[PDB]
Amino acid sequence: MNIFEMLRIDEGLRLKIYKDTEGYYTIGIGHLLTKSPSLNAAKSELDKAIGRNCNGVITKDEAEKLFNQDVDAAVRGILRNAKLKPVYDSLDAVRRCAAINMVFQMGETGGFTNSLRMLQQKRWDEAAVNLAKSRWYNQTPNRAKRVITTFRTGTWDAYK
Ligand SMILES: C=CCCc1ccccc1
């Protein structure tokens, strides 16, 4: 298991524009296209992202390339953020995947100051409790539980 397998499980794969859990136009392996309610706006974002006129549909290869880019962008958002980088560097490799997963889902900016401190301190049970007191956990509880279990245990048990 690695960050790609983990997020592929959490996000699935759809080759036609769909709506995510917040109602936002998305494609591929959880690639957000736009928060605008306009499908035409989403289709324009898609064509720009892929480099061809897609008509709202992509190939598996294109979805996987977008996914690589998106995982890379999440890692970079961590490494460029003065609050996130020190915590990320303090984690082992499995827990680093949980961190990337959260940034992929909610963005580098997207209130976890106290959870970050507990993670840096390696207070895993306390961090797990604090992470669940969130809109994130309430709105996507099964995915949040898998990510939190990864932070709590440092194992892939929730995914296996
Ligand atoms: C768990 C809170 C936010 C995700 C994260 C965690 C640790 C390091 C970087 C990002």
Side-chain angles (χ1 to χ4, degrees), residues 1-113 115-160:
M1 199 91 46
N2 56 61
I3 183 56
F4 295 94
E5 296 192 4
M6 183 198 206
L7 278 166
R8 172 64 176 81
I9 288 164
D10 284 333
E11 300 291 341
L13 170 69
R14 299 177 74 174
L15 298 186
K16 174 39 158 134
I17 294 178
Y18 63 100
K19 285 179 177 181
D20 76 0
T21 70
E22 303 289 342
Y24 295 142
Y25 291 119
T26 304
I27 199 161
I29 307 167
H31 181 80
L32 172 67
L33 290 167
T34 183
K35 294 180 184 185
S36 162
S38 165
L39 179 55
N40 283 339
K43 286 178 169 177
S44 288
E45 291 301 305
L46 178 61
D47 291 354
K48 172 164 63 79
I50 303 296
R52 70 181 178 85
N53 286 156
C54 292
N55 194 31
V57 177
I58 60 171
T59 70
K60 189 178 183 264
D61 280 356
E62 291 167 340
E64 284 163 354
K65 184 169 183 176
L66 283 185
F67 183 42
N68 264 282
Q69 293 177 351
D70 291 346
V71 171
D72 214 25
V75 173
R76 284 181 177 276
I78 288 166
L79 297 177
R80 282 192 272 90
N81 188 291
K83 283 193 22 143
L84 299 180
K85 184 180 194 296
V87 186
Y88 180 82
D89 285 345
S90 79
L91 298 171
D92 56 277
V94 176
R95 294 187 170 90
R96 282 179 183 164
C97 291
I100 298 161
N101 192 306
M102 292 188 71
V103 172
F104 186 103
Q105 183 182 2
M106 290 174 277
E108 155 202 353
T109 78
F112 290 83
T113 303
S115 303
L116 286 161
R117 180 185 70 252
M118 296 174 193
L119 291 170
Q120 181 146 3
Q121 294 169 324
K122 305 192 176 301
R123 301 159 80 113
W124 307 125
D125 284 10
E126 297 175 80
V129 169
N130 187 265
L131 284 161
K133 301 171 173 171
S134 61
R135 180 182 188 275
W136 170 58
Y137 178 87
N138 284 99
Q139 301 302 132
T140 54
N142 281 340
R143 197 249 190 79
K145 283 167 184 179
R146 290 193 290 277
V147 173
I148 291 172
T149 291
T150 309
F151 276 129
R152 188 177 51 83
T153 68
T155 76
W156 291 113
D157 284 359
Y159 290 85
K160 291 180 316 229

